[PDB]
Amino acid sequence: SKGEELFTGVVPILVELDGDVNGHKFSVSGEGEGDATYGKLTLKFICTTGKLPVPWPTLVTTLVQCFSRYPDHMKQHDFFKSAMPEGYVQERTIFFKDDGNYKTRAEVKFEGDTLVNRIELKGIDFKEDGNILGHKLEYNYNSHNVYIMADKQKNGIKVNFKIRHNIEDGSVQLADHYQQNTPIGDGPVLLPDNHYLSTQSALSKDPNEKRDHMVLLEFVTAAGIT
Amino acid sequence: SDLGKKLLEAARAGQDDEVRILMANGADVNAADDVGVTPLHLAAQRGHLEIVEVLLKYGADVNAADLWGQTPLHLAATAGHLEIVEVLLKNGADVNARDNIGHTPLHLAAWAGHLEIVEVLLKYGADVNAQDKFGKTPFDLAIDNGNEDIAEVLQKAAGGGSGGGSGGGDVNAYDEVGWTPLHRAAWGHLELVEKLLKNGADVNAADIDGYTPLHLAAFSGHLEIVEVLLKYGADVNADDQAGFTPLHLAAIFGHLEIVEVLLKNGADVNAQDKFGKTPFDLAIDNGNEDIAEVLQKA
């Protein structure tokens, strides 16, 4: 209903990720802002425990789809904002083809005037000489289509897409994403007709940051409904 | 430094008085925070024209880039602040500056649907053919987001004028996710689907995930589009990388009429996806018993 009013302007963001991949424990914090009017994120992430034991690009999808641009004619299909401020639980399994998987559970909600994404990630069965633990991923990101479907019996949504990670020899590593979102609160939420998001991202580095980190610019827009 | 922070807060808050006070007290006009944002960024972004003007008079760097590669003109163009865009351009702003995705201000104006900004940028030398790092032109972004008036203007400026708002160019062009005009149109634009097919569009073009337009039409539940695609030779049993045929998708999402049309056109009821599931199986799994009955009888 009025969850979307919380996103009419620039909103500060905080991200906290607690991770464990093949026994390597790590913590990531992020801060920045989002403007859902334009579907734009401007963020910076730091691995606060030291060296990140996986490639930064593998963590992009885990690290706030409430900041997607939903055009006016699609406002009734924006589940993400409808669940605010109480927020939603976002759960994923990410299957890296011919390698391990991530399982994540996050809560995305307002805490004061800040939109907070707090995540737990567990990775298992990765190959020591694979693209992930072997750090063979290029430091970049592709454009994707994200497919969104209502999950009526859970009063939420299902989301599916495939992430394509460029590998340093010119090949591509697929990361198959299976996602579910459910509201935290009891209030009414919007269950959408089938549609998609289209994404753009750019990864970079802060020259003045000595810690392991990722600077992220992201543009996401919803489409597919007339 | 301490003054620098205060100028940033004042510029962000649109506090004209305090901005002039802080300047008179020696504040650095080119102060930057820990993400490269300057007072001119904040003033331009948030529509504070008078502050933009005084900062530039005092020597603010008009093309300062923040961590995400953004200049004040990027932010003004996105926000639709026309007068500020003009002022920035009049004070040496690079009209074709790039953010880290490779967006020019013209990309961003087209993205955000600001027609008057688009025209202004073109007037000041914006590169109408600029591509971002995903190959998108400003025209492409306009077409994508349904900003048809802007698409017309951009196509004319690119020298292929007339009829841009209703799409344009090669019917078999594809972008980096492998989408052709037909993939875009499959999402409920029936008359456009028809036009494209009559104009030679490849009905079975598969995108980067293996989806044909028929997959997308089945997913979005558009019966007449499913019908016209089949009429013009759509592969009724095309499988994506997950092994889904269009009949699988229709069975999942409860599209009975589409199920019937697919069967009529030779859909395979025994096709298994990657998890060994048939359309009947998925119909059961998703609570669509009526479709399950039709599928079994078939």
Residue numbers in the entry:
A (entry chain B): 2 to 64, 68 to 230
B (entry chain A): 12 to 309
Study text:
DARPins are engineered proteins that consist of 4–5 structurally similar repeats that stack on top of each other, forming a compact protein domain. DARPins combine all potential advantages of single domain binders over antibodies: they are small in size (ca. 18 kDa), possess high biophysical stability, have very high expression yields in E. coli, can easily be genetically encoded for in vivo applications and are devoid of disulphides and hence well suited for applications where they are expressed in the reducing cytoplasm. Structural investigations showed that these DARPins bind to different but slightly overlapping epitopes.
To connect 3G124nc and either YKKD or YRLK we chose flexible GS-linkers. Therefore, two linkers of 7 and 11 aa named GS7 (GGGSGGG) and GS11 (GGGSGGGSGGG) were tested for linking 3G124nc with either YKKD or YRLK. The resulting four constructs were named gc_K7, gc_K11, gc_R7 and gc_R11 according to whether they contained YKKD or YRLK and the linker used was 7 or 11 aa long. The complexes crystallized under various conditions with different unit cells and one to four complexes per asymmetric unit (AU). All GFP-clamps form 1:1 complexes with eGFP, in which the clamp indeed wraps around approximately half the eGFP molecule and creates a continuous large interaction surface, similar to the superposition of the two parental DARPins on GFP (Fig. 4(a,b and c)). The buried surface area (BSA) of the GFP-clamp complexes is 1625 ± 72 Å2. Between 7 and 11 hydrogen bonds were found in the different structures. Hydrogen bonds of Trp79 from the GFP-clamp to Leu44 of eGFP, Trp79 to Leu220, Gln81 to Lys41, His114 to Gln204, Asp143 to Gln204, Asn156 to Arg73 and Phe226/230 (numbering for constructs with different linker lengths, respectively) to Asn198 seem to be the most crucial ones, since they are found in almost all complex structures. The structures of the GFP-clamps confirm the intended design: both DARPin-derived domains overlay well with the parental DARPins when superimposed on eGFP. Most interactions between the DARPins and eGFP are found in the single DARPin complexes as well as in the GFP-clamp complexes, confirming that both domains can bind their respective epitope without strain or steric hindrance.
